[PDB]
Curated annotation (Swiss-Prot), chain A:
A lipid is attached at residue 59 (S-palmitoyl cysteine). This is Small ribosomal subunit protein uS17. Component of the small ribosomal subunit. Part of the small subunit (SSU) processome, composed of more than 70 proteins and the RNA chaperone small nucleolar RNA (snoRNA) U3. InterPro entries: NA-bd_OB-fold, Ribosomal_uS17, Ribosomal_uS17_arc/euk, Ribosomal_uS17_CS, Ribosomal_uS17_N. Keywords: Acetylation, Citrullination, Cytoplasm, Lipoprotein, Methylation, Nucleus, Palmitate, Phosphoprotein, Ribonucleoprotein, Ribosomal protein, RNA-binding, rRNA-binding. GO terms for molecular function: RNA binding; rRNA binding; structural constituent of ribosome.
UniProtKB/Swiss-Prot annotation, chain B:
It comes from the Eukaryota. It is found in: Cytoplasm; Nucleus, Nucleolus. Its main location: cytoplasm. This is Small ribosomal subunit protein eS6. The chain holds residues 51 to 230 of 249 of the full protein.
From Swiss-Prot, chain C:
This is Large ribosomal subunit protein eL24. Coiled coil: none annotated. It is found in: Cytoplasm. It comes from the Eukaryota. Component of the large ribosomal subunit. Belongs to the eukaryotic ribosomal protein eL24 family. Component of the large ribosomal subunit. The ribosome is a large ribonucleoprotein complex responsible for the synthesis of proteins in the cell. Residues 42-53 have a biased composition (Basic and acidic residues). It comes from Homo sapiens (Human). The gene is RPL24.
Curated annotation (Swiss-Prot), chain D:
Belongs to the eukaryotic ribosomal protein eS8 family. PANTHER family: 40S RIBOSOMAL PROTEIN S8. The modification Phosphothreonine is found at residue 129. GO terms for biological process: cytoplasmic translation; maturation of SSU-rRNA from tricistronic rRNA transcript (SSU-rRNA, 5.8S rRNA, LSU-rRNA); ribosomal small subunit biogenesis; translation. Its main location: cytoplasm. This is Small ribosomal subunit protein eS8. Gene3D superfamilies: 3.10.290.70, Ribosomal protein S8e, subdomain. Component of the small ribosomal subunit. Identified in a IGF2BP1-dependent mRNP granule complex containing untranslated mRNAs. Part of the small subunit (SSU) processome, composed of more than 70 proteins and the RNA chaperone small nucleolar RNA (snoRNA) U3. It comes from the Eukaryota. A lipid is attached at residue 1 (N-myristoyl glycine). Residues 7-25 have a biased composition (Basic residues). Coiled coil: none annotated.
Length: 151, 180, 62, 205
RNA sequence: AAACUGCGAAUGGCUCAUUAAAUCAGUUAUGGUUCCUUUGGUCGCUCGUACUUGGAUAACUGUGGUAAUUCUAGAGCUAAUACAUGCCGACGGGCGCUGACCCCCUUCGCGGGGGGGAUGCGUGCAUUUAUCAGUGGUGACUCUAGAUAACCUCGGGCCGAUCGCACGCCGGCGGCGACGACCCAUUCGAACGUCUGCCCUAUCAACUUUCGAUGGUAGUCGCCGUGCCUACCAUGGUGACCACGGGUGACGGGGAAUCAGGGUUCGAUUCCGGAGAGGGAGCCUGAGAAACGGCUACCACAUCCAAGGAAGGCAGCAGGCGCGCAAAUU
């Protein structure tokens, strides 16, 4: 309920729910065991994943992807896409002739697991690289740090 | 029985095609009337169909049954087959041999002659003949099978024996560290 | 009005003299009966066995 | 032929690119293999590396796991009930991965009644045949009757499943993609998903 | 000699038309894949005619056709490491489920417990699926290995119907090699991704999305990751940090010329990468081509003809014509 939006049934592919039991254990509770994995670089997998009820296959924690590659950081600008955000990375490109930098930026589309929330435009997000998720989406959000003005 | 085509333009007849005249066909390997230059290549060619008309250059005829009178060309003289059987079983067939008869004895020989050169008798090398060589190769490769089995047995026994000497020392380390 | 019949034609292997053995020799060896062939086989087999134990004695001699 | 390449496409911004090279072998797409229920028909394709892809045009049997009681039997496929992707695909009865399908209850009910010695999906009319009564009522030895009796505590079935047997048809879903694989194989729908999909197909009316 | 078979012809050689985040360079990834070969691993782990199996075809013999070709028909033969077909052997079993019956302990007996067991059914690696448990390995697997239930493609998977050289041993045994082979691993790679980097232009300021634009969910296709493609949803994505569009006498690099320091200009050209074989498109074969010294069309060109038809591809080497200020020996 409320977890199943879509036409197809929404599962957690590696977990078998329908394991049968006594009618004494059916009255106790239904808690389908989460599959969550510890992602490797020392990001503690958020509390909101391991307890949480949502299902997203492309999330790094609760789903099937592996984080390997570059690890980048950026700031959140535009989130109107479902389970993805657009972050911008700024930097200084050095022009040799003039001996100075010019500003530049690049926009990355990057996927965001529904465990993180309250992720608010203009805050720092550290992402890590995944295998291609979509046409423009090659990355994945590993940890979210708030903007400098949080209360 | 009707067999071969040729037409005034020289094309063959391919038994499948149901037309009269030309048909352009894509021929692949295994088809009639094309032999491929390179592996797995197809050609488009011109093929005259399988229906017989006054249009044909030439018509090839097989003779299925001989009725009465003997024709000058096709009947009176009989031409032998050169090259009797090269395979063991084909020979056992020609001469009706039990498995226990020597094939070596019965093989047809070619009576080869030329003017100025000594008269020869040729014989083809028999293939699929049981023989000391063939029989040997068999027990050879079986012997290799014995070898492999032996090797897996000895290796298994060995690594099993080695695993225990690691295991009792892993038990010693764990137990001593724990009791401490 | 229609044709319901599919003709079944037969293939026959005739006989021809093979160069070096004329049809008389082919038929001479073919029509040879079991007594004749069994005699020839056992005789050649025993001649070969004798030559072979002779060559085993000729292996141990050298 | 059909190119599944990425370079016929707009950029992230959407400016069309002019293709630098003409189409390459390895980017090839093949035609769709739609798979229908009928007597078995299968076409081998040779693919990259020279390996055989087994393609399924008509299928009949598929084998399925009844996961609760952990068995798998080789069953006959009947019909395509539901497909998340396309309604058109239900209509022509096409077998794809994750479409949902009706199977013969039969070999399951047989296994079950052999394991637990209990009635399954039988009418309340209770009418029986000799083989049935000799398998179900049977005869026991002391150690035997204790075994079977010990399992009788375990075997009870979700009312939904129970009903399915009574109808002769089970609801199942296909995990293997016959298109490339060559077999349509899968698992019986049990519990929550089963109730869910039941809700979708009652909703289809 | 020939011919069948096997392998190679995907390299190399040439040119620079296209191509402006494309190619390409450094950087990384494949935990998201394919890999002829080479090197090592495996190759009696499966419990169910073999001292040898079936048919055909080429060279060859002959009869032929057509103006014409590296065209080919019909009739005879005959091979295999070509095609197919298909066993003994180990092999006695072991292990799983089944379990007629039997024993023992215990019990007043029912019962409770420990066993033992004829009978069938399953029995390996690959394949596809589901479930269980948690030997070895990572920064991290839905990894590797294990156990359970089944599955297994007639357009079929593994298990050698093969070859040589030495000849020896107690009618039996065997030494060295050659090919093969499913599958690991390896090598050469290949293919897609990551981060950053390109010349001129505003007399191009908004662009993309009914025909995929951006993302979601399930699939199809593919060697796999992916709007690659379909179905259904969402309304996104890019842009003065110059998108989008146009231009380039634009293949990108390594480099070259010139230079105090800083630059400017050039890089078709011998190394590395990319593209292309008159223009487009589409496939066979294969480990590997969307191949052009393979093929099939259409367009443009052009050769032969007995007028029916046939054959083409120098941006390989030479050489010839044309173009041109401009470039070598059949
Ligand atoms: Mg392979
Ligand atoms: Mg050849
Ligand atoms: Mg080679
Ligand atoms: Mg090897
Ligand atoms: Mg000839
Ligand atoms: Mg012939
Ligand atoms: Mg999708
Ligand atoms: Mg997908
Ligand atoms: Mg669509
Ligand atoms: Mg140019
Ligand atoms: Mg340049
Ligand atoms: Mg250059
Ligand atoms: Mg030059
Ligand atoms: Mg080059
Ligand atoms: Mg090319
Ligand atoms: Mg030219
Ligand atoms: Mg090859
Ligand atoms: Mg081409
Ligand atoms: Mg050429
Ligand atoms: Mg070439
Ligand atoms: Mg030239
Ligand atoms: Mg001049
Ligand atoms: Mg000059």
């Amino acid at each position: 309920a409320d977890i199943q939006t879509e036409r197809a049934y929404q599962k957690q592919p590696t977990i078998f729910q329908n394991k049968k039991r006594v009618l004494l254990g059916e009255t106790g509770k239904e808690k389908l065991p989460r599959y969550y994995k510890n992602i490797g670089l020392g990001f503690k997998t958020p509390k909101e994943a391991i307890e949480g009820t949502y299902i997203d296959k492309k999330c790094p924690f609760t789903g099937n992807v592996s984080i390997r590659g570059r690890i980048l950081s950026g700031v959140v600008t535009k989130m109107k896409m479902q389970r993805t955000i657009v972050i911008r990375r700024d930097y200084l490109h050095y022009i040799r002739k003039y001996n100075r930098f010019e500003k530049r930026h690049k926009n990355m589309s990057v996927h965001l697991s529904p465990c993180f929330r309250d992720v608010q435009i203009g805050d720092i997000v550290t992402v890590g690289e995944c295998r291609p998720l979509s046409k423009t989406v090659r990355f994945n959000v590993l940890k979210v740090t708030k903007a400098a003005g949080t209360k | 029985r009707i067999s071969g085509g040729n037409d005034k333009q020289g094309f063959p007849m391919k038994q499948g095609v149901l037309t009269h005249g030309r048909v352009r066909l894509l021929l692949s390997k295994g088809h009639s009337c094309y032999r491929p230059r390179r592996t797995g290549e197809r050609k488009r060619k011109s093929v005259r169909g399988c229906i017989v008309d006054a249009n044909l250059s030439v018509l090839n005829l097989v003779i299925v049954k001989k009725g009465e009178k003997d024709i000058p060309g096709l009947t009176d003289t009989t031409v032998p087959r050169r090259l009797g059987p090269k395979r063991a079983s084909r020979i056992r067939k020609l001469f009706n041999l039990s498995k226990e008869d020597d094939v070596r004895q019965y093989v047809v020989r070619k009576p080869l002659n030329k003017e100025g050169k000594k008269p020869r008798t040729k014989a083809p090398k028999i293939q699929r003949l049981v023989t000391p060589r063939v029989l040997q190769h068999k027990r050879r490769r079986i012997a290799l099978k014995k070898q492999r089995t032996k090797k897996n047995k000895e290796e298994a026994a060995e690594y099993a024996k080695l695993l225990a000497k690691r295991m009792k020392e892993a038990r010693e380390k764990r137990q001593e560290q724990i009791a401490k | 009005x229609x044709x319901x019949x599919x003709x079944x034609x037969x293939x026959x292997x005739x006989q021809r003299a093979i160069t070096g053995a004329s049809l008389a020799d082919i038929m001479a060896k073919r029509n040879q009966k079991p007594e004749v062939r069994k005699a020839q086989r056992e005789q050649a087999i025993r001649a070969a066995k004798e030559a072979k134990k002779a060559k085993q004695a000729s292996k141990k001699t050298a | 032929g059909i190119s599944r390449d990425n370079w016929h496409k707009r950029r992230k911004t959407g400016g069309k690119r002019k293709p630098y090279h003409k189409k390459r072998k390895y980017e090839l797409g093949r035609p769709a293999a739609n798979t229908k229920i009928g007597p078995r028909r299968i076409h081998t394709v040779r693919v990259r590396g020279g390996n055989k892809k087994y393609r399924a045009l008509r299928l009949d049997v598929g084998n399925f796991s009844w996961g609760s009681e952990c068995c798998t039997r080789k069953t006959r496929i009947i019909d395509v009930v539901y497909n998340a992707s396309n309604n058109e695909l239900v209509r022509t009865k096409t077998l794809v991965k994750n479409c949902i399908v009706l199977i013969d209850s039969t070999p399951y009910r047989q296994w079950y009644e052999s394991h637990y010695a209990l009635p399954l999906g039988r009418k309340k009319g209770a009418k029986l045949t000799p083989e049935e009564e000799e398998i179900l009522n049977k005869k026991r030895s002391k150690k035997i009757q204790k075994k079977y009796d010990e399992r009788k505590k375990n075997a009870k079935i979700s009312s939904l499943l129970e009903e399915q047997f009574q109808q002769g048809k089970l609801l199942a879903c296909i995990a293997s993609r016959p298109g490339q694989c060559g077999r349509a194989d899968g698992y019986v729908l049990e519990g929550k998903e089963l109730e869910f999909y039941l809700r979708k197909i009652k909703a289809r009316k």
